[PDB]
From Swiss-Prot, chain A:
This is Chemotaxis protein CheA. Residues 1-173 form the Histidine kinase domain. Involved in the transmission of sensory signals from the chemoreceptors to the flagellar motors. CheA is autophosphorylated; it can transfer its phosphate group to either CheB or CheY. It is found in: Cytoplasm. The chain holds residues 356 to 540 of 671 of the full protein.
Length: 173, 173
C-alpha cells in the first residue's frame, strides 16, 4: 500500500489546526509513494495525526512569539517516509519550541520516578523517553503502544528553541 | 585530585595485559590533569580497568589480523578525560573489531528477551544496551553498576571493524 492513502488526508487537517491555534505552518510531505504492508498504513494514521497535532500545538509557536524569538514567522512541519533496507522510517519534524528536558527531569523527580542525585548525568534519550510513561504530562504512551504492536520502534530527538523530530521505524512486512 | 592518580597505573596494566594476550597495543592517555572529587578518584579505577581489559581482549585484533584486514598494523587504545560543564567525561576508545550487533540480537533472541520481528527495527543504542543486561555476556552490567553508584551515566558506541567507544559521564559532586 502506498502510505499516501494516509498522508493525503493530512494537509487539510494540519492547516485547519494551524488556523484554529493561530499559527502559520508550512507543511511539507516527502516520500508519500513509500509502500509498505497495508496493515501498517491502516494503523499508523492515528498515531501520526497525534504527532502532527503535538507539533502544531506544543511545538510551533504563534507568529508573534516566533518573531519575538527572532525565528522565521512561518513554522515548518515535515512528515516523511522512506525505505531504509527492509524497514520504513517515518519522521515528523518541526522547527518549534522543542521539548524542555529540564522540565521533564523536574516532573520525573516530582512524580517519584527518579532521584535528584541521578539526574545530573541522565542521557538525552533516557530523559525524552519519560514522555512515553502514561501518567506523564491519544497520548504519547498510546503512540508508542501502537508502534510496538506493529513490531516497530519510536524515538524522539529535540533541542530547546530549535524543534523536535519523532522517528518511527516499521518493518516492511 | 587529578585523575592521573588513577590513570598513572594503567600503562603498566595495559602492557601486562597486551603481553599476556599476545596483542600489540598503542596506548594513549589524554586529559590526565583533569581534576575531580576524591570519591570518584578512588572508585573509578576498577570500571576503567574493566573497559581497558575489554578493549585489549575482545577489541584490538592481533597485528597479523589487522594487516590482513588492511588496518594500521598496531591497534590503538585511547583513554581520555575532560571537563564538560560541571561534569567530567571519560572515554575509552579502541580501533579494533567492534561489537557484532547481529551476534547481540541472536543472543537476545536465544535468551528470550526479544522475538525476531521486533529485532528488525531496534536502533543501534537499543541493540548495544543489551550488553548492560546482567549476565548478558554472563561484563558491562558490572561497569554500569559502579558508574551508577557514582550517579554517573555510561554509553557505548561501536561498529563492526571500526572499533568501540565507551563514554562515562560523572557529576563531579
Ligand atoms: C511535549 N511535546 C510533545 N511533542 C512536542 C513537540 N513536537 N514540540 C514541543 N513539545 C512537544
Ligand atoms: C563485548 N565487548 C565489550 N567491549 C568490547 C570492545 N571494546 N570491543 C569488542 N567487543 C567488546
Amino acid at each position: 500500500v502506498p502510505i499516501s492513502f494516509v498522508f493525503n488526508r493530512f494537509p487539510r487537517m494540519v492547516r485547519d489546526l494551524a488556523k484554529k491555534m493561530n499559527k502559520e505552518v508550512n507543511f511539507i510531505m516527502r516520500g508519500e509513494d513509500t509502500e509498505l504492508d497495508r496493515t501498517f498504513v491502516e494503523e499508523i494514521g492515528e498515531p501520526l495525526l497525534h504527532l502532527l497535532r503535538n507539533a502544531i500545538d506544543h511545538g510551533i509557536e504563534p507568529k508573534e512569539e516566533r518573531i519575538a524569538k527572532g525565528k522565521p514567522p512561518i513554522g515548518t512541519l515535515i512528515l516523511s517516509a522512506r525505505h531504509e533496507g527492509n524497514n520504513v522510517v517515518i519522521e515528523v519534524e518541526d522547527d518549534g519550541r522543542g521539548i524542555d528536558k529540564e522540565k521533564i527531569i523536574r516532573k520525573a523527580i516530582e512524580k517519584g520516578l527518579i532521584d535528584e542525585s541521578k539526574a545530573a548525568t541522565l542521557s538525552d534519550q533516557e530523559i525524552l523517553n519519560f514522555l512515553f510513561v502514561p501518567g506523564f504530562s491519544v497520548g504519547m504512551d498510546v503512540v508508542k503502544n501502537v508502534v510496538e504492536s506493529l513490531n516497530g520502534s519510536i524515538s524522539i530527538e529535540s533541542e530547546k528553541d530549535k524543534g523536535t523530530k519523532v522517528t518511527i521505524r516499521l518493518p516492511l512486512t
